[PDB]
Amino acid sequence: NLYFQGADSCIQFTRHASDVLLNLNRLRSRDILTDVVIVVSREQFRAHKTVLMACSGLFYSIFTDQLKCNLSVINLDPEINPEGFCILLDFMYTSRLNLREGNIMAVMATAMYLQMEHVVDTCRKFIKASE
Amino acid sequence: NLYFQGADSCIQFTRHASDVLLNLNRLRSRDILTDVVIVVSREQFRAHKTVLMACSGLFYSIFTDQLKCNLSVINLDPEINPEGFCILLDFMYTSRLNLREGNIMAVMATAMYLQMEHVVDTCRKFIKASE
Numbered sequence: 714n715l716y717f718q719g720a721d722s723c724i725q726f727t728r729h730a731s732d733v734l735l736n737l738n739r740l741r742s743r744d745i746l747t748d749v750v751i752v753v754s755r756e757q758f759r760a761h762k763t764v765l766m767a768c769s770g771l772f773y774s775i776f777t778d779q780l781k782c783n784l785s786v787i788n789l790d791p792e793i794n795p796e797g798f799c800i801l802l803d804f805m806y807t808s809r810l811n812l813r814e815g816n817i818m819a820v821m822a823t824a825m826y827l828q829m830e831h832v833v834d835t836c837r838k839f840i841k842a843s844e
Numbered sequence: 845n846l847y848f849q850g851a852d853s854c855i856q857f858t859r860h861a862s863d864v865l866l867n868l869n870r871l872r873s874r875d876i877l878t879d880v881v882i883v884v885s886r887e888q889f890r891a892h893k894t895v896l897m898a899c900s901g902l903f904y905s906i907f908t909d910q911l912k913c914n915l916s917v918i919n920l921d922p923e924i925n926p927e928g929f930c931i932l933l934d935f936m937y938t939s940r941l942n943l944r945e946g947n948i949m950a951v952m953a954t955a956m957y958l959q960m961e962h963v964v965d966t967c968r969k970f971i972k973a974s975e
């Protein structure tokens with residue numbers, strides 16, 4: 714079944730949120746209604762400001778600032794690893810985090826900078842397992 | 845736990861999609877980065893085009909049209925019931941559909957017009973239960 718009786722009066726749809734996220738990622742792949750470019754070193758990543766704000770404390774602060782909310786280009790710290798950013802951007806649109814031994818440190822440092830608490834805590838737990 | 849091993853290599857976060865949707869609804873309540881007004885009769889509803897496109901076949905068609913994608917105001921058919929639209933807009937941002945005996949017909953007619961198949965099918969199943 715696609716739905717159930719929630720704790721409240723409303724009928725709740727089980728796959729709705731993941732279906733919305735899937736469709737937002739489809740818009741991203743097709744470059745539909747993307748309204749910002751995130752520049753990390755040489756690399757450029759097109760995205761939707763609302764998705765970035767929904768996932769990152771840093772992007773929330775940037776796009777709620779009256780001066781910066783209108784910027785079409787956002788440059789991150791040039792010390793940010795582009796692959797780490799790419800993995801986190803993918804995560805934002807999919808719920809899947811491609812953590813590997815070779816990228817975990819860059820992913821963690823990027824999540825810290827982006828203020829993505831859950832990802833930071835997760836990276837920390839995986840690092841602790843290896844020691 | 846916040847995460848699990850998905851069918852693929854990636855670590856998947858269980859609540860990520862619903863957390864993104866919750867944050868998108870918070871942006872809507874605060875009128876943050878809303879980029880469209882949907883006019884239904886007298887009523888006005890501010891929203892995010894990408895959320896509308898992710899949930900509705902009609903909004904997908906409107907905002908992928910080269911001429912209409914830039915419109916800041918969208919007028920729906922004046923025969924659309926504002927309460928039915930409100931319930932569906934709430935559903936888009938929350939996954940909860942407030943269906944009641946008094947609104948089910950308007951909600952169904954609105955979902956048909958908006959091309960929200962899952963909601964139409966659901967309304968049809970609930971109507972069938974009463975007969």
Ligand SMILES: C[C@@H]1CN(c2ncc(Cl)c(Nc3ccc4c(c3)n(CCC(C)(C)O)c(=O)n4C)n2)C[C@H](C)C1(F)F
Binds near residue numbers: 770773829830
């Ligand atoms: C009043 C306002 C409500 N908040 C909020 N609203 C909307 C968004 Cl887009 C949003 N996005 C957002 C902001 C910060 C985040 C954030 C999202 N995430 C990601 C959380 C999820 C569950 C998406 O992984 C995260 O780790 N941090 C630190 N947050 C939290 C903020 C602190 C607030 F209190 F100021």
Ligand SMILES: C[C@@H]1CN(c2ncc(Cl)c(Nc3ccc4c(c3)n(CCC(C)(C)O)c(=O)n4C)n2)C[C@H](C)C1(F)F
Binds near residue numbers: 900
């Ligand atoms: C190539 C492109 C991919 N599609 C798609 N991509 C992105 C979005 Cl925003 C999106 N949104 C969208 C469009 C139509 C919808 C639609 C969303 N929904 C809602 C589906 C969910 C699961 C969100 O309830 C629905 O019932 N209908 C009919 N769909 C389906 C369309 C038909 C397509 F094939 F042309």
